[PDB]
Amino acid sequence: LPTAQEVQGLMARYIELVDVGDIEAIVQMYADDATVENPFGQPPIHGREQIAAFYRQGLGGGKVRACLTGPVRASHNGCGAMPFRVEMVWNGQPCALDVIDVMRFDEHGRIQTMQAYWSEVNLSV
Amino acid sequence: LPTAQEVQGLMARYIELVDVGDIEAIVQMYADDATVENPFGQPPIHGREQIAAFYRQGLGGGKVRACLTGPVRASHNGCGAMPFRVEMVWNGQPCALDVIDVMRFDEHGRIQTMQAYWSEVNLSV
Numbered sequence: 001l002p003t004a005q006e007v008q009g010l011m012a013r014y015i016e017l018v019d020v021g022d023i024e025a026i027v028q029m030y031a032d033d034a035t036v037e038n039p040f041g042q043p044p045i046h047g048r049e050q051i052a053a054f055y056r057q058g059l060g061g062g063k064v065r066a067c068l069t070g071p072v073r074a075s076h077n078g079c080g081a082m083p084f085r086v087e088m089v090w091n092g093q094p095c096a097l098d099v100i101d102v103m104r105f106d107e108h109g110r111i112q113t114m115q116a117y118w119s120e121v122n123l124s125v
Numbered sequence: 126l127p128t129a130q131e132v133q134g135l136m137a138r139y140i141e142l143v144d145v146g147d148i149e150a151i152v153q154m155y156a157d158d159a160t161v162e163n164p165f166g167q168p169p170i171h172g173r174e175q176i177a178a179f180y181r182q183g184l185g186g187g188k189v190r191a192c193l194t195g196p197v198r199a200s201h202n203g204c205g206a207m208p209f210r211v212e213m214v215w216n217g218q219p220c221a222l223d224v225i226d227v228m229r230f231d232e233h234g235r236i237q238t239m240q241a242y243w244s245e246v247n248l249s250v
């Protein structure tokens with residue numbers, strides 16, 4: 001599994017790919033069996049093709065940015081958690097969404113699970 | 126089952142109790158049979174007594190301080206995640222540890238599970 005240090009690097013790489021909106025590069029970070037819950041509380045999405053659709057719908061339209069708002073917390077079992085802020089425009093309203101993602105990596109360094117904690121209370125104009 | 130706003134309030138209250146070292150009130154925020162994984166990656170501890178013993182050892186003498194370093198992220202299914210910083214002593218000097226806790230609350234508003242994401246990569250001097 002990725003070490004704690006490697007998890008910090010991988011999760012920051014993920015943020016960079018979201019921030020520039022490189023949909024195909026994001027998808028390659030995920031394993032073929034990856035399970036994403038985004039937002040946590042909803043039915044998951046499974047596998048690269050379905051995960052690609054999330055990012056294309058979310059990032060492929062208007063300009064979206066993402067940046068870490070604190071350090072990546074990494075564990076000794078290939079897992080980590082990070083706080084970040086997504087900026088977007090929602091029907092003319094400039095918005096920010098505060099999110100925490102929790103990720104578990106597999107032994108090939110790919111994302112096997114991700115949970116994105118956020119809801120509407122985390123949105124602001 | 127706490128709404129997203131209620132989760133934000135409960136998790137913020139937890140931080141205040143840690144900051145003032147109110148171990149009895151912290152324990153009462155947990156369900157009687159809750160689990161804590163702290164750090165995430167270690168075996169869960171189970172039940173209010175083990176959880177109490179954990180907070181007594183970690184907080185019992187001061188001068189631990191704790192504060193949120195960003196907003197509480199909350200779901201619609203009674204869960205949340207928060208970034209915070211703990212200030213304590215390591216090797217006789219003041220240190221800081223960045224942590225993310227993920228909590229799931231029961232239908233009585235008590236913490237059923239807590240997972241604390243951090244490792245030594247999050248410890249600074």
Ligand SMILES: C[C@]12CCc3c(ccc4cc(O)ccc34)[C@@H]1CCC2=O
Binds near residue numbers: 018057064086099
């Ligand atoms: C999809 C989205 C843009 C990107 C995004 C959102 C929410 C959680 C995310 C979590 C991620 O790990 C990466 C991107 C998002 C926004 C919710 C509404 C929206 O437009």
Ligand SMILES: C[C@]12CCc3c(ccc4cc(O)ccc34)[C@@H]1CCC2=O
Binds near residue numbers: 163213222224243
């Ligand atoms: C115990 C501790 C202070 C409190 C604390 C730590 C780590 C994770 C925590 C998670 C919490 O939800 C509440 C408190 C802590 C530190 C690890 C070493 C130390 O001094």
